[PDB]
Design a binder for this molecule. Structure first.
Ligand SMILES: CCCCCCCCCCCCn1cc[n+](CC(P(=O)(O)O)P(=O)(O)O)c1
Ligand SMILES: CCCCCCCCCCCCn1cc[n+](CC(P(=O)(O)O)P(=O)(O)O)c1
Ligand SMILES: [Mg+2]
Ligand SMILES: [Mg+2]
Ligand SMILES: [Mg+2]
Ligand SMILES: [Mg+2]
Ligand SMILES: [Mg+2]
Ligand SMILES: [Mg+2]
Lengths: 355, 362
């Protein structure tokens, strides 16, 4: 748990040491090293490390204790999920026009970096994961399975990101391969404002890589066979938790304090399909629906304030607090159907310290 | 060869079919399908397919035969390289502010798409490769090596792309002033750095951004699938020939940027204005007068018609064409000469054939 945070250097340096065997001039290696060490440090560190820790804990509680070389393998997987979260966040911040991430400037904003490097850096971070899993796990029998779990969890995440970005776009309300001139002014589409669609989005963009992936990694490494019916249970629990997690993320966007979140709220002006939007829309008068349509999704101070004051008016805080409690019970109740004391504990623990 | 282009549908749909197993609402499935089918068609089609055909041919001419299900596995690897080329290109065109690719608008320029979709679409195209390799090769014994070969060739391409993109940047000149993590405000106005204008640095760059994925990768794919063991000393010879061919390929690409005709190349030149370390730039710089050096420093790397014209009219004054022609002939011989030290008639044949049709295709 604090052992985890100590190993970071080792995994970071094992990758950087791969790059350094490349066939390059020495001065050029020096530059590569400088740049990519900062890419890792700036983007991998400063998080809560929930996903990484969940790998460690699942591994430990499925087993009956664990030598130092086994911890090396588990910690690798833990740091691989964190590297994945780093990549996802660097990409998300490009897509959502981020300002601040973990209390500092978004990577893509930096004048030495820009969008062109940040795009290139994401794919690098992504691929570094698989090189690290090779270095430390190429000889484990769970090897192929672990790498399929990263690959599939990623694919789902990309699909959710696509939905999150396009769900309101004209695409969805044929793609014009001749239009490069006429930009789509963002509007909300009333038909897509429902929980069914929301759940589709958040389960894919969040649930698989934040929950399913770390848990499965621990399980795979501890040697639970891929065919055990437990995996399907863990998948369902993961969906519940991801939905729980993302709804809380949505709530923080409006109601959180950015000095504590480390990031600036932006869902309203970015025209996002969020929980607060859906809830308000389900609750509000017909004129207030018209007001939302006219005001949502505009980078414009008075507009955002109207949507804000609607969230207060319809008591979205209170409705969240009320969602949080029902969903927590529903999750706990699914957890108790696992029939595995070790995993059930870790998931209950996770639930407590998730925020 | 035309068998290869026929198989495309099968691999595209195999992946599309996988997406369509996802737990989503039926109408959302319909939208996903329609978007991602176009993603693949728009970007995977219309190329010369050199890298893909190189896999097919290597597969064939190591072997002495091959049934329809062995070919299905090879064709898959062939299309996977073409998917990889599609992804690299969508990403390149973002990085290089492209206008035109294969005679149409770059994917990222489309108003239905934009940068935020194209970036997401690249990782998608990337991962689709590994899903395809799993569908068709999960039981082959060469499986784990194949996916390592993609992974590693990709890593080298990315590093090449970083150098291609940063080699003249303050990052690399100042080099002793660290990356300022507090500057989002003051944008680096781009200038060339004279210390980097040499072939050694060039070769570093083009070997990584071009040679590994365009030559090493497809060849090693065919070889791994046909059954040559990963320890055979021929791989290291194939590596060295790949370096030579990639160098040779990129220098030609650089030549096309300035001297090509864009209705034939399918893309608009942009190296001078994007501040790229190119072969023409280095040749000129090695030949030209001292005042002409200064003129290059002032004018190179500005999106600015008069400035471009200056550089371009320098390339014409020092006759960079001729110099290219003279490079092309010497490098070709150097490559033929290496190919003949393979001691493998099939591969040697395929590489010599590749050399003939590299710029023309088919
Ligand atoms: C979403 C971010 C993750 C994905 C990022 C992938 C990064 C790797 C991109 C490598 C592109 C290498 N490559 C080599 C050759 N060119 C052709 C062009 P030129 O080298 O730019 O001249 P051309 O435009 O002339 O055809 C491109
Ligand atoms: C190959 C390079 C191309 C990029 C390919 C990878 C793109 C996939 C992006 C996955 C990110 C999903 N993800 C889930 C959670 N959030 C957090 C933010 P939210 O935007 O509110 O969901 P927040 O900024 O509020 O914390 C992001
Ligand atoms: Mg987002
Ligand atoms: Mg965001
Ligand atoms: Mg958010
Ligand atoms: Mg480029
Ligand atoms: Mg280019
Ligand atoms: Mg070029």
């Amino acid at each position: 748990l604090a052992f985890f945070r100590n190993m970071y250097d080792k995994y970071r340096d094992a990758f950087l040491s791969h790059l350094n065997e490349y066939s390059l001039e020495e001065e050029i290696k020096e530059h590569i090293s400088k740049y990519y060490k900062l890419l890792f440090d700036y983007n991998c560190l400063g998080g809560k490390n929930n996903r990484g820790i969940l790998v460690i804990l699942i591994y430990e509680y499925v087993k009956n204790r664990i030598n130092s070389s086994e911890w090396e393998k588990a910690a690798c997987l833990a740091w691989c999920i964190e590297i994945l979260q780093a990549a996802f966040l660097v990409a998300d911040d490009i897509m959502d026009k981020g300002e601040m991430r973990r209390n500092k400037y978004c990577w893509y904003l930096l004048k030495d970096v820009e969008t062109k490097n940040a795009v290139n850096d994401v794919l690098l971070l992504y691929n570094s994961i698989y090189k690290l899993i090779e270095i430390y796990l190429r000889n484990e029998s769970c090897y192929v399975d672990v790498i399929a779990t990263f690959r599939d969890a990623t694919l789902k995440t990309i699909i959710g990101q696509h939905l999150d970005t396009n769900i309101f776009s004209d695409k969805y309300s044929e793609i014009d391969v001749n239009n490069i001139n006429v930009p789509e002014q963002p509007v909300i589409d009333i038909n897509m404002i429902n929980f069914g669609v929301y759940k589709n989005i958040v389960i894919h963009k969040t649930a698989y890589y934040s929950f399913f992936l770390p848990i499965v990694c621990g399980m795979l490494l501890a040697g639970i066979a891929v065919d055990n019916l437990i995996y399907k249970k863990i998948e369902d629990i993961s969906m519940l938790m991801g939905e729980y997690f993302q709804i809380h993320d949505d709530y923080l966007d409006i109601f959180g304090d950015s000095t504590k979140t480390g990031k600036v709220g932006s869902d309203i002006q970015n025209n996002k399909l969020t929980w607060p939007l859906i809830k308000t829309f389900e609750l509000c008068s017909e004129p207030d629906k018209i007001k939302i349509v006219k005001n949502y999704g505009k980078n414009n101070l008075a507009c955002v304030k109207v949507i804000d004051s609607l969230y207060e008016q319809y008591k979205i805080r209170k409705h969240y607090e009320s969602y949080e409690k029902a969903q927590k019970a529903k999750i706990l109740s699914a957890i108790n159907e696992l029939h595995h004391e070790g995993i059930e504990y870790v998931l209950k623990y996770l639930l407590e310290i998730l925020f």
